[PDB]
């Protein structure tokens, strides 16, 4: 025996999908300290006496603290809260800080090159160790504390039986000196669980109920694990507690005086519907997703009014399949063109959805109301930067002409955005990655003038209804006018020209359906003929 105990465990303890990080840290540290000393002397190298943990809130750092406190056979860990060493009386803060290391130094003095190791866990280390720049405050307690700790960790005297694990929620507010080599090295980041750690966490937090047979056979763990994405352990535990709470309250009745339905709630089981309701209206991930965008851009579904609608989707599928299985072309772009009010954004969104790329985003002008051009450039750059961290991606930039602020009087637009967009359409991603860019515009000629149409790789048309038969088919598939009304409508449109877009058709039908039954058809025909216009 040197330090570790026979029962590695690591599954009963509670720690979940953190395996690679723990193995790597055990590789870097706790390795030179466990080996015949003779070989170490033969190479002649010292140990590492500093570890820093950081990550997004709710990942399991504090739990790791206690588990490490239990998962060792050393003397004992000393855990001290961050902002509890400051004291009012002069000189007491330094006394408190220096009081910690006495045992380790004394033992090293008694047994040099021998003895065990003492581990000190500094929770909320960012509270006391701030930048020593100004602090704009009388007295230098904050500076003195950091200087004293820095002198103790590394100084004229050499200590080799101490290890410090500093856990922080935001590394930005950490002094520069400690992160330098020789003070605190081997800094790890603890991220979110991906797919298997999520299932392990949900199993760890649900073992008890199944132990006592409290989970109905309807519930499936794998379904919940797949459904929930971009969650952190705290979120999973909260979801489980929320489903439990939904049932607990389901078995109770209290309007006037709190009353429990005993002998009616003696048998209690949790159903899948409880989990669905909790996931839908109780717990929402902090990272965020694009459910609202996807459900808002395709508002009234997609229908089949003729041959043209299928061709665009087929070409989009072909382009996606190309970007999947090629190595000579790591970047592909496509442009969607057409007259206004033809449903280009919806078709682009559908094409993007059809593919199952892990990362998808839509950058639309709706989020940049009132921004100057610099902010627009920064936002676009950030979107692309984040899109540059995956093996596959798809970014949809719709309504290009509204990004450049184009107005046909003079004309006038912004140059920085145009140049940034012209450069970001030709930068390949880091080796071994792919990307697909889709653009939506309504004025092809203007773009052709600025010399942007040749940066794109291909263009696909998006026509609108241009024949009476197509209009009749679309009206039938929408299901508003039927029987005699459709007969008269077909009679009026003698297979003549009808240059109307789908959105305008929806609006005209809705506007026509507001009067008494006798006049609906007449109003619809009048509006169609008046606005009907010409190609």
């Amino acid at each position: 025996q040197s330090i570790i105990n026979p029962d590695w465990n690591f599954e009963k303890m509670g720690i979940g999908g953190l395996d690679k990080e723990f193995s790597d840290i055990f590789r870097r540290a706790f390795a030179s300290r466990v080996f015949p000393p003779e070989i170490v002397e033969q190479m002649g190298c010292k140990h590492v006496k500093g570890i820093l943990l950081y990550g997004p809130p709710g990942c399991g750092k504090t739990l790791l603290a206690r588990q490490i406190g239990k998962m060792l056979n050393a003397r004992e860990p000393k855990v001290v809260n961050g902002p509890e060493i400051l004291n009012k009386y002069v000189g007491e803060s330094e006394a408190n800080i220096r009081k910690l290391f006495a045992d380790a130094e004394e033992e090293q003095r008694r047994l040099g090159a021998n003895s065990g190791l003492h581990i000190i866990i500094f929770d909320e280390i960012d509270a006391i160790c701030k930048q020593r720049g100004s602090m704009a405050g009388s007295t230098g307690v904050h500076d003195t504390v950091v200087n004293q700790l820095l002198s103790k960790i590394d100084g004229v005297e050499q200590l080799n039986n101490i290890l410090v694990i500093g856990m922080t929620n935001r590394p930005d507010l950490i002094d520069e000196a400690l992160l330098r080599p020789g003070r605190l090295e081997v800094k790890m980041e603890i991220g979110l669980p991906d797919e298997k750690g999520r299932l392990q966490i949900l199993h760890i937090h649900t073992a008890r109920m199944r132990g006592h047979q409290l989970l109905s056979a309807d519930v499936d763990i794998k379904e919940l694990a797949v459904e929930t994405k971009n969650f952190s352990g705290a979120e999973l535990e909260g979801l489980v507690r929320a489903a439990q709470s939904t049932a607990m309250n389901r078995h109770i009745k209290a309007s006037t005086k709190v009353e429990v339905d005993m002998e009616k709630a003696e048998s209690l089981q949790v159903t899948r519907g409880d989990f669905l309701a909790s996931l839908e209206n109780d717990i929402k991930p902090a990272f965020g997703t694009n459910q609202e965008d996807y459900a808002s851009y395709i508002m009234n579904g997609i229908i089949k009014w003729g041959d043209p609608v299928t061709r665009v989707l087929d070409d989009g599928e072909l382009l996606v399949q190309q970007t999947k299985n090629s190595d000579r072309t790591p970047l592909v772009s496509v442009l969607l063109e057409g007259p206004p009010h033809s449903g280009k954004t919806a078709l682009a969104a559908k094409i993007a959805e059809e593919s199952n790329f892990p990362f998808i985003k839509i950058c639309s002008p709706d989020k940049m109301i009132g921004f100057s051009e610099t902010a627009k450039c920064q936002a676009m750059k950030k979107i692309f930067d984040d899109a540059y961290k995956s093996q596959l991606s798809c970014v949809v930039v719709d309504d290009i002409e509204r990004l450049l602020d184009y107005v046909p009087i003079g004309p006038r637009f912004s140059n920085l955005v145009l140049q940034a967009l012209l450069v970001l359409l030709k930068k390949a991603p880091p080796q071994g990655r792919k990307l697909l860019i889709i653009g939506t515009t309504s004025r092809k000629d203007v773009l052709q003038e600025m010399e942007m149409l040749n940066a794109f790789s291909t263009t696909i048309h998006v026509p609108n209804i241009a024949t009476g038969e197509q209009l009749l088919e679309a009206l039938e598939l929408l299901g508003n006018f039927k029987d005699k009304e459709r007969t008269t409508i077909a009679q009026q449109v003698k297979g003549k020209k009808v240059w109307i877009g789908i959105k305008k058709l929806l609006m005209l039908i809705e506007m026509s359906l507001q009067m008494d039954p006798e006049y609906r058809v007449r109003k619809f025909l009048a509006l169609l003929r008046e606005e009907g216009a010409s190609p």
Binding site: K88, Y89, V90, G91, E92, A136, G137, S138, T139, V141
Partner: protein
Amino acid sequence: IIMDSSISKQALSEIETRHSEIIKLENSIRELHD
């Protein structure tokens, strides 16, 4: 070009026996008790 600043003070653990009464302890130990 302006920045108003606030200050925070600290008290001192005044000790009656940190000087001039260690001598009084000696005057109490080595003299009075002797």
